[model samples]
Target: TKCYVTPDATSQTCPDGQDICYTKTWCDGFCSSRGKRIDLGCAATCPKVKPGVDIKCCSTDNCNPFPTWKRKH
Candidate 1:
């Protein structure tokens, strides 16, 4: 499977054992930073996140899109 990697939105092929595409977003309130942050990659399993963080996983190639807030700004 293939996943979009990095905030730069480049594509990467997942290794044989890692078939899940994941999108991890750190909301604005999670840190002192000015805006939300996003990361995308392939994972064998999705991670557990804290209150202000959001994570989503999908199983198809390039199925994860940039976090909604990221696309607006």
Candidate 2:
């Protein structure tokens, strides 16, 4: 599939199908923290964009959280 940051940025389909589309950066600094992830059930669910924006994986169950930056690796 594919994932993307809301309101603007978007990600090309994950090479390995890592496109689970998550958003945990809004809850805290988890996205940039290097190893922090949490799920608060994305309200307004930026189309799973928040996590995409932070360039971090919302690699959990229910996470959604930005916009800008290049495609993440």
Candidate 3:
């Protein structure tokens, strides 16, 4: 939860197939569940920045990097 600590993003409602935290109501910050593998550059993407506008940062380094699980951020 390194990214969540300082908050590159913020606690938001869970995406599809994900559920909100019953106890916490929301997560900590700026990312999905962290279930996906991440590297140094890619940490968390802006949830508001929709793709097709920019293509270099769904996370730390770039946007829409994950071809399989394209970040909606």
Best by TM-score: 1
Would you list the clashing residue pairs of candidate 2?
A: 23-63, 23-64, 23-65, 50-65, 50-66
Model 2, 1-73: lDDT tens digits are 4444443334333434433554444433445443333332222233444434343455433223333222222
lDDT for every model? 0.58, 0.38, 0.28
Displacement of residue 5 (Cα, Å) in model 2 is: 0.7
**Model 3 over residues 47-72: C-alpha lDDT tens digits?**
45443332222322122222222243
lDDT of 2 at 1: 43
- Model 2, stretches more than 4 Å misplaced? 6-9, 27-73
Task: Indicate the residue-level lDDT of 10 in model 3.
Answer: 47
Point out the worst 10-residue segment of candidate 1 by lDDT: 64-73
Instruction: Count residue pairs with overlapping backbones in model 3.
Output: 8
Displacement of residue 28 (Cα, Å) in model 1 is 7.0
* Candidate 1: tens digits of C-alpha lDDT, residues 1-73: 6665454444555655347777676764436233345575676667575676667777766665443344432
Off by over 4 Å in 1: 5-18, 28-36, 47-49, 65-73
TM-scores vs. true structure, each candidate: 0.51, 0.24, 0.15
Better of 1 and 2 by TM-score: 1
Between prediction 1 and prediction 3, the one with superior lDDT is 1
Which 10 successive residues of model 3 have the least lDDT summed? Answer: 17-26
The whole-model C-alpha lDDT of candidate 1 against the native structure comes to 0.58
